[PDB]
Swiss-Prot record:
Enzyme nomenclature, EC number: 2.1.1.6
UniProt-recorded name of the protein: Catechol O-methyltransferase
Origin organism lineage: Eukaryota, Metazoa, Chordata, Craniata, Vertebrata
Catalytic class of the enzyme: transferase
UniProt-annotated binding residues for S-adenosyl-L-methionine: 41, 63, 71, 89-90, 116-119, 140
Binding residues annotated for Mg(2+), in chain numbering: 140, 168-169
S-S bridge residues: none
UniProt GO BP: artery development; behavioral fear response; catecholamine catabolic process; catecholamine metabolic process; cellular response to cocaine; cellular response to phosphate starvation; cerebellar cortex morphogenesis; cholesterol efflux
Modified residues (Phosphoserine): 215-216
Annotated GO MF terms: catechol O-methyltransferase activity; magnesium ion binding
UniProt PTM: The N-terminus is blocked.
Topological domain ranges for the Extracellular compartment: 1-218
Catalytic activity as recorded in UniProt: a catechol + S-adenosyl-L-methionine = a guaiacol + S-adenosyl-L-homocysteine + H(+); 2-hydroxyestrone + S-adenosyl-L-methionine = 2-hydroxy-3-methoxy-estrone + S-adenosyl-L-homocysteine + H(+); 4-hydroxyestrone + S-adenosyl-L-methionine = 4-methoxyestrone + S-adenosyl-L-homocysteine + H(+); 2-hydroxyestrone + S-adenosyl-L-methionine = 2-methoxyestrone + S-adenosyl-L-homocysteine + H(+)
């Protein structure tokens, strides 16, 4: 049958208002709530995401995992003129839906969808995409890659003192190794935010981990 993804875009195109990102977000959440797709209702985590963007005003954000574009719309709508969101998405069909979602929102010029695996694309950011360092990273892709890709971002020199990592679903289904690393490391200052998931009626969470610069070479 029809994929969740194509149905979410259909619902937006039929119910939301073009060039009104808030209406796009609300339509996605309304539809996903009706379908009882707990991991696709974004308003609770969105409150936390919005507060991060508003506080830190990042000029260059990297997102890992786009899906249908909800979080890309959520973040891009709060970015300044001339700021940039890069979003990495391994599934071309999801990249395609995300692109269409952004076009409907009117936010396509602020976002570049990078089609590929994070582990393959991250080492290309410096030279192929002319990145210095990222201001913010939103981790929302394959859970077992949160820690490896954080280490990869570090090694490739893409983090600076002050870079804000924000990781979703750190409790459900969980990213315990990622949490133990950033919480235990002097290179990250961490804050935890509770975020409810409907139907499962569980308190998931997001972790904010602000990079402090590398550990001493000695
Ligand atoms: N290694 C990887 N690199 C890039 N994208 C990946 C990946 N592993 C999984 N993904 C993608 O990560 C996504 C997770 S769902 C992302 C949800 C989205 N951030 C939102 O808030 O709506 C899926 O679309 C999946 O295809
Ligand atoms: K720490």
């Amino acid at each position: 049958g029809d994929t969740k993804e194509q149905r979410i875009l259909r619902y937006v195109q039929q119910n939301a208002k073009p060039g009104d990102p808030q209406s796009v977000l609300e339509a996605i959440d309304t539809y996903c709530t009706q379908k009882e797709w707990a991991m696709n209702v974004g308003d609770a985590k969105g409150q936390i995401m919005d507060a991060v963007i508003r506080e830190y005003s990042p000029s260059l954000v990297l997102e890992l995992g786009a899906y249908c574009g909800y979080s890309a719309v959520r973040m891009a709508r709060l970015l300044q003129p001339g700021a940039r969101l890069l979003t990495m998405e391994i599934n071309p069909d999801c990249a395609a839906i995300t692109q269409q979602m952004l076009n409907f929102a009117g936010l396509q010029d602020k976002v570049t969808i990078l089609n590929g695996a994070s582990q393959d694309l991250i080492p290309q950011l410096k030279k192929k995409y002319d990145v210095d360092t990222l201001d913010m990273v939103f981790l929302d892709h394959w859970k077992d890659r949160y820690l490896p890709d954080t280490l990869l971002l570090e090694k490739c020199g893409l983090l600076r003192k002050g870079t804000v990592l924000l990781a979703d679903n750190v409790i459900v289904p969980g990213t315990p190794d990622f949490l133990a690393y950033v919480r235990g490391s002097s290179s990250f200052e961490c804050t935890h935010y509770s975020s409810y998931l409907e139907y499962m009626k569980v308190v998931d969470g997001l972790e904010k981990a602000i990079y402090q610069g590398p550990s001493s070479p000695d």
